[PDB]
Amino acid sequence: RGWFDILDDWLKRDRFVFVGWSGILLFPCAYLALGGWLTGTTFVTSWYTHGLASSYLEGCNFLTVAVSTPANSMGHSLLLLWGPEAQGDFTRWCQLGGLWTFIALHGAFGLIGFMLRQFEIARLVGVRPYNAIAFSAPIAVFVSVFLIYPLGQSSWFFAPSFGVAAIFRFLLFFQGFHNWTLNPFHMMGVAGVLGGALLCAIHGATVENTLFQDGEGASTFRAFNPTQAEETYSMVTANRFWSQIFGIAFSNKRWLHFFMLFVPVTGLWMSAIGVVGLALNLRSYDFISQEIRAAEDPEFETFYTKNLLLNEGIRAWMAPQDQPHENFVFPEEVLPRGNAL
Amino acid sequence: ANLWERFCNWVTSTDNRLYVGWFGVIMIPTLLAATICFVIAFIAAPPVDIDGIREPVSGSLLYGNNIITGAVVPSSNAIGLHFYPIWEAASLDEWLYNGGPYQLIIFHFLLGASCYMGRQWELSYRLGMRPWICVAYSAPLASAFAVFLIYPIGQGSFSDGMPLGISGTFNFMIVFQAEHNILMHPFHQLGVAGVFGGALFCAMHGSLVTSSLIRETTETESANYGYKFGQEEETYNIVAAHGYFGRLIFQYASFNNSRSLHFFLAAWPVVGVWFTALGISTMAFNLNGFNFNHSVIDAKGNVINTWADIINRANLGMEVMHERNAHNFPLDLA
Amino acid sequence: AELTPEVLTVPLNSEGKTITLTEKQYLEGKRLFQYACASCHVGGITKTNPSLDLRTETLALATPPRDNIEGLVDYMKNPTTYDGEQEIAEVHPSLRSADIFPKMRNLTEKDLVAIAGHILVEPKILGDKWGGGKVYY
Amino acid sequence: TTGERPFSDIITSVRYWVIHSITIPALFIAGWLFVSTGLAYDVFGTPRPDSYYAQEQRSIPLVTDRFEAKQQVETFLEQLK
Amino acid sequence: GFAWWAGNARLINLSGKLLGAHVAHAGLIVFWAGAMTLFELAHFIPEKPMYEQGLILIPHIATLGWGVGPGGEVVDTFPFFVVGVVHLISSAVLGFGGVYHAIRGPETLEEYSSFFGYDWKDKNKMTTILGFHLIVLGIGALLLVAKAMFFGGLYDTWAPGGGDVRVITNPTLDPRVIFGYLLKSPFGGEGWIVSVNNLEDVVGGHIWIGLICIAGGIWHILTTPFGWARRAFIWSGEAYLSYSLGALSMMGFIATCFVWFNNTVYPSEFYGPTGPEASQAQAMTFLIRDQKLGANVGSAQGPTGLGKYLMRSPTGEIIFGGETMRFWDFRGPWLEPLRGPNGLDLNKIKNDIQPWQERRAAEYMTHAPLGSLNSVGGVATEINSVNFVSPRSWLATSHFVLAFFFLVGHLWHAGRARAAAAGFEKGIDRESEPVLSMPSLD
Amino acid sequence: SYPIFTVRWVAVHTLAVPTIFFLGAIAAMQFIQR
Amino acid sequence: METLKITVYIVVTFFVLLFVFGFLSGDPARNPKRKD
Numbered sequence A: 001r002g003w004f005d006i007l008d009d010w011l012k013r014d015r016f017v018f019v020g021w022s023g024i025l026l027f028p029c030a031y032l033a034l035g036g037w038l039t040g041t042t043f044v045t046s047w048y049t050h051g052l053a054s055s056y057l058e059g060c061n062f063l064t065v066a067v068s069t070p071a072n073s074m075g076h077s078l079l080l081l082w083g084p085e086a087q088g089d090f091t092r093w094c095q096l097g098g099l100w101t102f103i104a105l106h107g108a109f110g111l112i113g114f115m116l117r118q119f120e121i122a123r124l125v126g127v128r129p130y131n132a133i134a135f136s137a138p139i140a141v142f143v144s145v146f147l148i149y150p151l152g153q154s155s156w157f158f159a160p161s162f163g164v165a166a167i168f169r170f171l172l173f174f175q176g177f178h179n180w181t182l183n184p185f186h187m188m189g190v191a192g193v194l195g196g197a198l199l200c201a202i203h204g205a206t207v208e209n210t211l212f213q214d215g216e217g218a219s220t221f222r223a224f225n226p227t228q229a230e231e232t233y234s235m236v237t238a239n240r241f242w243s244q245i246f247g248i249a250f251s252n253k254r255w256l257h258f259f260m261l262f263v264p265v266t267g268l269w270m271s272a273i274g275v276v277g278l279a280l281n282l283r284s285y286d287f288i289s290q291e292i293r294a295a296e297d298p299e300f301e302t303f304y305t306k307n308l309l310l311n312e313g314i315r316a317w318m319a320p321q322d323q324p325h326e327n328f329v330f331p332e333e334v335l336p337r338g339n340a341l
Numbered sequence B: 001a002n003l004w005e006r007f008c009n010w011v012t013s014t015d016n017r018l019y020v021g022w023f024g025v026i027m028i029p030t031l032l033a034a035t036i037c038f039v040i041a042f043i044a045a046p047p048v049d050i051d052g053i054r055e056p057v058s059g060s061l062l063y064g065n066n067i068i069t070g071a072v073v074p075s076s077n078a079i080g081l082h083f084y085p086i087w088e089a090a091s092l093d094e095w096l097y098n099g100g101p102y103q104l105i106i107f108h109f110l111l112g113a114s115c116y117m118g119r120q121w122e123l124s125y126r127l128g129m130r131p132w133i134c135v136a137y138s139a140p141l142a143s144a145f146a147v148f149l150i151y152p153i154g155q156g157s158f159s160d161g162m163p164l165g166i167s168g169t170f171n172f173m174i175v176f177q178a179e180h181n182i183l184m185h186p187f188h189q190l191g192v193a194g195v196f197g198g199a200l201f202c203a204m205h206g207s208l209v210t211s212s213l214i215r216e217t218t219e220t221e222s223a224n225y226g227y228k229f230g231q232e233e234e235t236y237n238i239v240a241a242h243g244y245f246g247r248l249i250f251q252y253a254s255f256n257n258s259r260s261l262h263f264f265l266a267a268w269p270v271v272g273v274w275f276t277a278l279g280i281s282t283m284a285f286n287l288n289g290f291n292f293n294h295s296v297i298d299a300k301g302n303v304i305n306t307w308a309d310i311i312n313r314a315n316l317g318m319e320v321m322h323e324r325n326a327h328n329f330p331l332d333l334a
Numbered sequence C: 001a002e003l004t005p006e007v008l009t010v011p012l013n014s015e016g017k018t019i020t021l022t023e024k025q026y027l028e029g030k031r032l033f034q035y036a037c038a039s040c041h042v043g044g045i046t047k048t049n050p051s052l053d054l055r056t057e058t059l060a061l062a063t064p065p066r067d068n069i070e071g072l073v074d075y076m077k078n079p080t081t082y083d084g085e086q087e088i089a090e091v092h093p094s095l096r097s098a099d100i101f102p103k104m105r106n107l108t109e110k111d112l113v114a115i116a117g118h119i120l121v122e123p124k125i126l127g128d129k130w131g132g133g134k135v136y137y
Numbered sequence D: 001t002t003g004e005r006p007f008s009d010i011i012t013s014v015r016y017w018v019i020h021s022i023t024i025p026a027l028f029i030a031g032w033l034f035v036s037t038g039l040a041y042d043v044f045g046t047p048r049p050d051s052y053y054a055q056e057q058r059s060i061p062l063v064t065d066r067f068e069a070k071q072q073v074e075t076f077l078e079q080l081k
Numbered sequence E: 001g002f003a004w005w006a007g008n009a010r011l012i013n014l015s016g017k018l019l020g021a022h023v024a025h026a027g028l029i030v031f032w033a034g035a036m037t038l039f040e041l042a043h044f045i046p047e048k049p050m051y052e053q054g055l056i057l058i059p060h061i062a063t064l065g066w067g068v069g070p071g072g073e074v075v076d077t078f079p080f081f082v083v084g085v086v087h088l089i090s091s092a093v094l095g096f097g098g099v100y101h102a103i104r105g106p107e108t109l110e111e112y113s114s115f116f117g118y119d120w121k122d123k124n125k126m127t128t129i130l131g132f133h134l135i136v137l138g139i140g141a142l143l144l145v146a147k148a149m150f151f152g153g154l155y156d157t158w159a160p161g162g163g164d165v166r167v168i169t170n171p172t173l174d175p176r177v178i179f180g181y182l183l184k185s186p187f188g189g190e191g192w193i194v195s196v197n198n199l200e201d202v203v204g205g206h207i208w209i210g211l212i213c214i215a216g217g218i219w220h221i222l223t224t225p226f227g228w229a230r231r232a233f234i235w236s237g238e239a240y241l242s243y244s245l246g247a248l249s250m251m252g253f254i255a256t257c258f259v260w261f262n263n264t265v266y267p268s269e270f271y272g273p274t275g276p277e278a279s280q281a282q283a284m285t286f287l288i289r290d291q292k293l294g295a296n297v298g299s300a301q302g303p304t305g306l307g308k309y310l311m312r313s314p315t316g317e318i319i320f321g322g323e324t325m326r327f328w329d330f331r332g333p334w335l336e337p338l339r340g341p342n343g344l345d346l347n348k349i350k351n352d353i354q355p356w357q358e359r360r361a362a363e364y365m366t367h368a369p370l371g372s373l374n375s376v377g378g379v380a381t382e383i384n385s386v387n388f389v390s391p392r393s394w395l396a397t398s399h400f401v402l403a404f405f406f407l408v409g410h411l412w413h414a415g416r417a418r419a420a421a422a423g424f425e426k427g428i429d430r431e432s433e434p435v436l437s438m439p440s441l442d
Numbered sequence F: 001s002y003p004i005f006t007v008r009w010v011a012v013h014t015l016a017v018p019t020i021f022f023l024g025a026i027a028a029m030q031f032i033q034r
Numbered sequence G: 001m002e003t004l005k006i007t008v009y010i011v012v013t014f015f016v017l018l019f020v021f022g023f024l025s026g027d028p029a030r031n032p033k034r035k036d
């Protein structure tokens, strides 16, 4: 009955919000990441890091507001409040982009905390820890995109800024500079996310339309009982229906629900791998066969070459405002443009 | 015993390995026409003058494409929204140049896909099921109508419906962004929310059921063998799943009613994707995403850029480069 | 930076006399300019003849010079081609043609000055953007 | 079911609204003042509409040194005084 | 059986309360027509085109010939006011009948009067109600014919002189014209019924539809459904709602294409130019500009080798070049003077373009139906300045959405109707699962 | 016989107290003018 | 081409009529529960 156990006792009490040992890491870090984002989006500028306005205070709306990344000149500085850049000055710290690192790092440690929470509760309750395992997928994405990617580049500046439209810009950057749509690891992620949404919708609909009649009312929700032993819908009729509409169907409820975990988890993991390649500018940018033929044959044209022209438009038209530290000056006459436009 | 009656019984028979049905009577020939023409065109169609400027784009494998770059190319801008069946061409050589195969394939597919949805209603009736699976499927179906029919109708040309290929898809979505700012459109944002949320809830539901499977097996065998097809008892403990997830968040944000839970699974990505289909369908009539270009200015009136303005620099690069020989006047109005 | 009298100060005429607009007049002219003009002249370009813009240096080389309140107010009454050679009231909105261009009907004389003032002030604020087109968006 | 007091029972309770019909406007007002007093600008370093540029300036005051960065924005800020 | 969120299904067999719901909802419809009109009028400025002003109801009234004169000049705003007031006042009476019948009046009607009472499964009674409404609809379409021919006429964008209100003296009656539209292809250059381009055909069709609806309304009062109909349909209140949902959905998609393409019953003077119109107009504008400078637009080879200003359609007609080659089916009153039999005529182009045509083209070009959801006009890359989204976009997009969900609603209610009719809408009977009594597929 | 102050009490106020404050600050902001 | 056109009109018409008459043939009654 030492103090350690007394604390364990208290941390693991059944209450409206379970705390647990993982609570000690989760709750401060989750609350700080989230408070930093609301604080910066309400009050803090990106004028000195990006030449952008980015808070409600400056005139931005929910779509355009963001906690932006530090200036390229910070490199990968941890940008600690007490560090050599801001030197304890809260105000300067904000102005130099210190809230980005605050949010990214407290967020990483909250994610760990949350995954430890899934592990802690699963152990206390007596269930298998497959929900913690599935949550590895979000983690991979977050670390690869917000940490590994800009660590392979010149600075945090080129990580995603925390904002709706800042993220849209990140999407478009990756098309023009990395040709990310062409990347087979992104395509595998696409198929996992879309395949996940499909599975989600097809499994819910199927259950709802093979229900057993277990009550008299037109509202069928009332006729389930959390503790009934009986399946509430017919796997058998569900299986014949899909075998006859689609050719194949699930027959194993256990396989089905594992497949539902497997598909979206795997796809997110594949896309994380691809982003690690782009950390290094290791892109699937080109097909060498196409380029050789196109250079020699001015009549040969594909959707592959058309999209590279668009990427070239993107880079030159957005680079100078998007990378202000580079002092890109592109006089009118060097901008790629088609006819009239 | 009558001849028509025996035909009708075979069409609607619940004993064919694949259900036919009256919707099937139209679906099968049209999906076969679309599929066969697709396969041949993808492998072997010669280049197609999509933009009507006598600048043919090669889409097939034998004309120097791979699986990722290939496509059935949309039909010529010279045709616009005109119906261009084979018998309207002076020859197959003309029909191939102007992109006839695209029309054939899309019209047959959209018909056959529409009957696919009907077929889903129909078999549900023959089997004594509830009927609304087909409603779930209307979301993807709607999405296909938008990129192959509604957007072409609003923009005046099938040259601007989505190519039938991997890289052509990307072309279509880049040009859309340049012209409509789809990322800044709320209905597209609800599509992402429906798709991200769908993948999330897919993973959640699959991991919760999987976590609460009842021990029915040994370490040396797939747990999947703990469920036998058609057993009457449930194969997991939902109260255990509820008890874990309720504590993970808090009790009242977790489902203990499996019917509510499975209806929620159905509605979230269906509705999200209706909205995103509606996004393409309304941007087809050029009601575009929010425009905050130069919305922030200072006391003097300098423009103070935001992320919206950076997005606009990117959209501009797409704009000025797409279909680089096809514009003779300063505004790309369709 | 702010909207100071030195920026709100623009040529009245070609003699070289000046007038200092009020903030009011400036914003009055901006609004009136969006109402009657921006459909073709958003950002100081001319959507229907992009070869002619509202930059000060272009207006300065128009015949008669239009880089001043007098020239611009006059143009709004009796528009001409750039070389002054033909009157184009039939195809350009003007008080002279307010019967076919109905938006010009409720424009008073001081509205014209606010509009001419806006046109001359905005380049001092926005620089190359004014009349530069999408390259500078 | 865990022994805290039910939410529905607190927010219909007269004692609850006696406190929170003060505490909620006081907080809303306090937030107001933080902005209307100008304090939020000074705390966070956020430019006022009149202080993004110097009058004739069109250069962004972009930080370009890591360890001199603090000194840079202070220099850019007195180039407005 | 039903929960609160499906609580209106509790009215299926309460004819009197369900009457109140319908009449009260009809009151909401009339209310909005009234209030919305008064709003638009209150905000209306006559010197500005209607389409710069976010107006959708004034243009429908103008189109009936009220308040406008030649060219669409608004000459009298009082018809607008009247239309708004009378609608708004009428909604109180319908509101009144609605609340009464939903709250106080008899829950069920079939006891009060044997006339107003109905049972969904009474095929005779149902076809009789249908016939009454068919006659009403038929009367209504004749009202429009009466306006056109005997009470001031309609606005005619095609009238010589820039457009004008015009009485329709010779409505088209030839059924080869009228029904010919119904058999034209919906594809480009044809356009099914959306391609109607003259008020004589508009008025003539409404004569026919009026007679057809009255005839069929009398038919359905006099008959009961034949057996082939009895056996092919489901006869229930939800079934009938599903049939109407399908029909409203189809109608909504048609209306979408009507307001997007048709510039006759949606005159461009009021609604703004169509997408094709604005696109043709830009090519006209630069043809005009370049020719004044001395360009020979006929002989000018653009980059691709196609004409920079003029080219041929796939059937040879001379048309506008650039991307607008897709819109060569466009026909508008500002453009038709330049057309000969081979299409655009090069000698009229060189010689006979008028200022009013130059003006119309500049205006329509700069009012193309492109704009952001927050009403910034122009292409998605344009800067703020011009507050504008075309009425045609607002009307097209809204009715595509509504049409779509009504189609979803048709599938929802049709499939439920079928399942309820067969007795398995609440789920599968465990003791009699149909699949468990079928042979296995393999 | 319920407690007034709990872990629950705290988590709620941890969020709701700055939420209102922030809504006040943002409300004022709609009235800022350049 | 004209022969192709006839053939398709014929093929399409045929399938569309199978569809129309198939559902006219008492489709409500082809379910596993209640037949009428």
Ligand code: CLA
Pocket: E004, E005, E006, E007, E008, E009, E241, E245, E405, E406, E407, E408, E409, E410, E412, E413, E416
């Ligand atoms: C003529 C039109 C019509 C009619 C009369 C009915 C009638 C009915 N429907 Mg159907 N339905 C329709 C159209 C129609 N529907 C359409 C178009 C769809 C597709 C979306 C559906 C989809 C549908 C479903 C899925 C279901 C019904 C059901 C029902 C029944 C109960 C409905 C109820 O109580 O709603 C109560 C009303 C509400 C719960 C409020 C809904 C509010 C909507 C979702 C929000 C819209 C927001 C608005 C656009 C913008 C917000 C602005 C903001 C400021 C407020 C009833 C018989 C139920 C049924 O089958 O019963 C037999 C049922 O389950 N309907």
Ligand code: CLA
Pocket: E003, E004, E005, E006, E007, E008, E010, E011, E014, E017, E018, E020, E021, E022, E024, E025, E092, E094, E095, E096, E099, E102, E103
């Ligand atoms: C167009 C919208 C519409 C209409 C016309 C109706 C109409 C009706 N509903 Mg439905 N309902 C609707 C929308 C609508 N509902 C929506 C959106 C929902 C989702 C929340 C529901 C959910 C719902 C449920 C759950 C139930 C109904 C029921 C009913 C009926 C009985 C209600 C009753 O007795 O009220 C009693 C209410 C009052 C006495 C309160 C006052 C209401 C009045 C009408 C307010 C009017 C104020 C107005 C300004 C006055 C102008 C007066 C002037 C013209 C003289 C009635 C016919 C009930 C039913 O079927 O009963 C059998 C029922 O159980 N409805």
Ligand code: CLA
Pocket: E019, E023, E093, E094, E096, E097, E098, E100, E101, E105, E106, E109, E112, E113, E116
């Ligand atoms: C189409 C909608 C509709 C329908 C089917 C009914 C049906 C019914 N109502 Mg209801 N009612 C309605 C609308 C409707 N009413 C409206 C809009 C109001 C408000 C004015 C009322 C107010 C009302 C009251 C106060 C009462 C009823 C009663 C009745 C019942 C007896 C009717 C009778 O004998 O009338 C006798 C018939 C006549 C006197 C002939 C009237 C001729 C009408 C007014 C002219 C019709 C012209 C045209 C259709 C209107 C369009 C004009 C406009 C577009 C400008 C019957 C079931 C009574 C009832 O149920 O008691 C239990 C009752 O007390 N109704």
Ligand code: CLA
Pocket: E127, E130, E134, E182, E183, E212, E213, E214, E215, E216, E217, E219, E220, E223, E224, E225, E226, E229
């Ligand atoms: C609101 C409108 C309406 C409604 C709902 C009904 C409903 C009905 N009618 Mg009535 N009818 C109406 C108006 C209406 N009618 C009018 C105005 C007339 C006068 C011309 C008639 C004349 C009439 C007759 C003569 C008969 C009916 C019959 C029937 C019943 C069978 C309907 C059926 O099977 O159709 C299904 C339709 C078909 C099986 C064939 C349709 C084929 C066409 C070509 C489809 C084309 C669709 C296409 C996509 C759109 C383009 C149109 C095309 C022409 C270009 C049903 C109760 C029958 C009955 O039992 O009456 C006692 C009957 O014999 N109706």
Ligand SMILES: C=Cc1c(C)c2cc3nc(c4c5[nH]c(cc6nc(cc1[nH]2)C(C)=C6CC)c(C)c5C(=O)[C@@H]4C(=O)OC)[C@@H](CCC(=O)OC/C=C(\C)CCC[C@H](C)CCC[C@H](C)CCCC(C)C)[C@@H]3C
Pocket: A029, A030, A033, A034, A037, A038, A103, A104, A106, A107, A108, A109, A110, A111, A114, A131, A134, A135, A137, A138, A142, A161, A162, A163, A164, A167, A193, A196, A264, A265, A268, B196, B197, B199, B200, B203, B204, B207, B248
């Ligand atoms: C953008 C999409 C997206 C979001 C928003 C999201 C969100 C979430 N997923 C969770 C869970 C999950 N996600 C899962 C699978 C997936 N999740 C996906 C995509 C997402 N998942 C996908 C596609 C999948 C499929 C594999 C699973 C399987 C789970 C869970 O088990 C769990 C859950 O319970 O779901 C119900 C929750 C974790 C809560 C938490 O950590 O609290 C603690 C909060 C912390 C630690 C703070 C993190 C701070 C972040 C990382 C940085 C700062 C962010 C800013 C505040 C906001 C910036 C916003 C701008 C960018 C616009 C949370 C609601």
Ligand SMILES: CC1=C(/C=C/C(C)=C/C=C/C(C)=C/C=C/C=C(C)/C=C/C=C(C)/C=C/C2=C(C)CCCC2(C)C)C(C)(C)CCC1
Pocket: A031, A032, A034, A035, A036, A038, A039, F014, F015, F018, F019, F020, F022, F023
């Ligand atoms: C950073 C930092 C910190 C902290 C901080 C914090 C922690 C904060 C918090 C904050 C917060 C905590 C905030 C909040 C706010 C909120 C908000 C601002 C909200 C909003 C909302 C809204 C607006 C909503 C609305 C709506 C909508 C929109 C839709 C739907 C419905 C609703 C109603 C929901 C410290 C000190 C450590 C220091 C360092 C730095």
Ligand SMILES: CC1=C(/C=C/C(C)=C/C=C/C(C)=C/C=C/C=C(C)/C=C/C=C(C)/C=C/C2=C(C)CCCC2(C)C)C(C)(C)CCC1
Pocket: E021, E024, E025, E027, E028, E031, E085, E088, E089, E091, E092, E094, E095, E096, E098, E099, E102
């Ligand atoms: C049943 C029910 C319901 C419904 C309701 C309804 C829908 C109602 C209706 C109602 C209505 C529908 C109403 C109406 C009203 C109106 C009125 C009452 C009007 C009046 C007006 C006036 C008075 C006018 C005046 C004027 C003039 C004369 C001139 C100009 C100006 C003015 C405007 C001033 C609900 C959902 C709620 C719920 C449940 C039950």
Ligand SMILES: CC1=C(/C=C/C(C)=C/C=C/C(C)=C/C=C/C=C(C)/C=C/C=C(C)/C=C/C2=C(C)CCCC2(C)C)C(C)(C)CCC1
Pocket: E177, E178, E179, E181, E182, E193, E196, E201, E202, E203, E204, E205, E206, E208, E209, E232, G019, G020, G021, G023, G024
């Ligand atoms: C006014 C007008 C006009 C005229 C119009 C007309 C004359 C119309 C007609 C219309 C019509 C006359 C329509 C028709 C309709 C029909 C329908 C739409 C049908 C439907 C059907 C169905 C839906 C069926 C179903 C089924 C089947 C198929 C099988 C068995 C089962 C059942 C029965 C379900 C015009 C253009 C000149 C111009 C402008 C104005």
Ligand SMILES: [Cl-]
Pocket: A306, B171, B175, B321, B322, B323, B324
């Ligand atoms: Cl392109």
Ligand SMILES: [Cl-]
Pocket: B326, B327, B328, B329, E321, E322, E323, E324
């Ligand atoms: Cl062009």
Ligand SMILES: [Fe+2]
Pocket: A203, A257, B205, B209, B262
């Ligand atoms: Fe499940």
